[PDB]
Amino acid sequence: ALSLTADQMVSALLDAEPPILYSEYDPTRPFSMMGLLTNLADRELVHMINWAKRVPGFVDLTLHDQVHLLESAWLEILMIGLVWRSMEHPGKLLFAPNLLLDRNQGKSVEGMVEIFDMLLATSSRFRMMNLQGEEFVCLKSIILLNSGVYTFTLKSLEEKDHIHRVLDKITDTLIHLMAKAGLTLQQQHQRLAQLLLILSHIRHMSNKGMEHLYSMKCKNVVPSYDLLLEMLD
Amino acid sequence: ALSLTADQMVSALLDAEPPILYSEYDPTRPFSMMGLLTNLADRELVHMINWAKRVPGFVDLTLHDQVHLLESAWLEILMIGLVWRSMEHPGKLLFAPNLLLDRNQGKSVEGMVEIFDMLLATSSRFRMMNLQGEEFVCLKSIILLNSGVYTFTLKSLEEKDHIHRVLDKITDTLIHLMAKAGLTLQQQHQRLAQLLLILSHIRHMSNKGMEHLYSMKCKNVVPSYDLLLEMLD
Ligand SMILES: Cc1c(O)ccc2c1CCN(CC(C)C)[C@@H]2c1ccc(/C=C/C(=O)O)cc1
Ligand SMILES: Cc1c(O)ccc2c1CCN(CC(C)C)[C@@H]2c1ccc(/C=C/C(=O)O)cc1
Numbered sequence: 001a002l003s004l005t006a007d008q009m010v011s012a013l014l015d016a017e018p019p020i021l022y023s024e025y026d027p028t029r030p031f032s033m034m035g036l037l038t039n040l041a042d043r044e045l046v047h048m049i050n051w052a053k054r055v056p057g058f059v060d061l062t063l064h065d066q067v068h069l070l071e072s073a074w075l076e077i078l079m080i081g082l083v084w085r086s087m088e089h090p091g092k093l094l095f096a097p098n099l100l101l102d103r104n105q106g107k108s109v110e111g112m113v114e115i116f117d118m119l120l121a122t123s124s125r126f127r128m129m130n131l132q133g134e135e136f137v138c139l140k141s142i143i144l145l146n147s148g149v150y151t152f153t154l155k156s157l158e159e160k161d162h163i164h165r166v167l168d169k170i171t172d173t174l175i176h177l178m179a180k181a182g183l184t185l186q187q188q189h190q191r192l193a194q195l196l197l198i199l200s201h202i203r204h205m206s207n208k209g210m211e212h213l214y215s216m217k218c219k220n221v222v223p224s225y226d227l228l229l230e231m232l233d
Numbered sequence: 234a235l236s237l238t239a240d241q242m243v244s245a246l247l248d249a250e251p252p253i254l255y256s257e258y259d260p261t262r263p264f265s266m267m268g269l270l271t272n273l274a275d276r277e278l279v280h281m282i283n284w285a286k287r288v289p290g291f292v293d294l295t296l297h298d299q300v301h302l303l304e305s306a307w308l309e310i311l312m313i314g315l316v317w318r319s320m321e322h323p324g325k326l327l328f329a330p331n332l333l334l335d336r337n338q339g340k341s342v343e344g345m346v347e348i349f350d351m352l353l354a355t356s357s358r359f360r361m362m363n364l365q366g367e368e369f370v371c372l373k374s375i376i377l378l379n380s381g382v383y384t385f386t387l388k389s390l391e392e393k394d395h396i397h398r399v400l401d402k403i404t405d406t407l408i409h410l411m412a413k414a415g416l417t418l419q420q421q422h423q424r425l426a427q428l429l430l431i432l433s434h435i436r437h438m439s440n441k442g443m444e445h446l447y448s449m450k451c452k453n454v455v456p457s458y459d460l461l462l463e464m465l466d
Contacts, residue, residue, distance in 0.1 A: 118383065118384060121383050122383060150434045167427075168426075171422055171423050185418070189405070190405070192422065192425065193400070193404040193425065197375070197379050200379065200436045203433045203437050204380075204440060
């Protein structure tokens, strides 16, 4: 994992990519949005577990630390995937290929249009930077490893060190991609910073969404430690 | 502002630095924590306004955009200052020089120990990286310009462009500092990434704190648009 070259890191991330899923509704029947969005997120989560297990370095950690990282990052990971999928659809969010929604459609749930807006703005930022697919898979892996690393014994000290070494290797990889693309050293650092600073906004979006989900006060909303543990163990 | 050299950028940021404030309690009387923390935050905010006006590029923006940026970033800015001040005090948060609190002291307010923990962990990360004062002022300015830039007309398009150009100049500056310190190009990119990724965790902490403050449901807690506008106008 730490002996991978930049090209090998990229290949491994592209190969791990999950599929794009469809919403489950009868397309021959007349057009609940939260129902549809919950079911889609439930099914994406299963595939996210399989993806995470294929990110280099991730299965080297303890199962408890794998669960902690996924618990912290899962909604950010869903959100970056949505933003990426929606990039060439100005003004719309491509939740699935059969579920392409505008901001007015989010107005149907109290608190949701604000989240829809923030997601559309991130998509439009990605569009303005001309984000590449190889840069997106790197960013997504960085979210997985970084989002829970500050909230965790000799074992833990070793786990945090390894997570930081893996993160350094993905930073190396990003820079390599930008060098292969022909950017100057100045441009390279500038773009790296631009990309990482968007991750702060993705955190914010997830925190805002988590607050909505927690406020629903429902045992079938938000995956528990135990469900994540069962799926990962 | 965009014509500043890296050295000039650093000098200007160091010069803008606000003072460290004291808690207001009678030190001769027996030892409310939330009272003391609110009063301290109220007074720090005034000084933060003056600081922000001295960050290069910031007064070039519209007053409405200055207010939006401060509204989004103020608690993150207080939190990064606390973490920096607390760096050489393992296990304790130096809220002020006369108010140095451990995690057990945070247990006195329902929900606060969790926030205290996250802040102690960030301080300990800064300690492990050996963060330098010149890097800290850069990071703090980056928070100010970045945290509200994705949530904002021809004027706005021009304002977001300028904010991104200012941010690129601070990225250049960071890298220059790390080059002056003797780091390799590889180390330079790696450390830049490490530093920016901590900003995501600072966002998360602020979101968690904002939720506590909003849940107090009090007109004298959280600065309004109008108060920020009055202080900045
Ligand atoms: C990015 C994304 C998806 O790809 C799929 C669903 C949702 C989002 C972001 C917006 N979000 C809605 C936001 C208000 C958070 C959708 C969502 C809806 C329900 C659940 C519930 C999951 C569960 O309860 O286990 C999670 C996310
Ligand atoms: C970093 C920091 C300070 O330097 C000063 C106070 C506080 C923090 C972080 C933790 N925080 C407590 C957290 C629960 C947010 C403190 C705080 C307390 C009250 C207020 C209220 C301000 C207002 O109501 O205008 C703001 C921050």
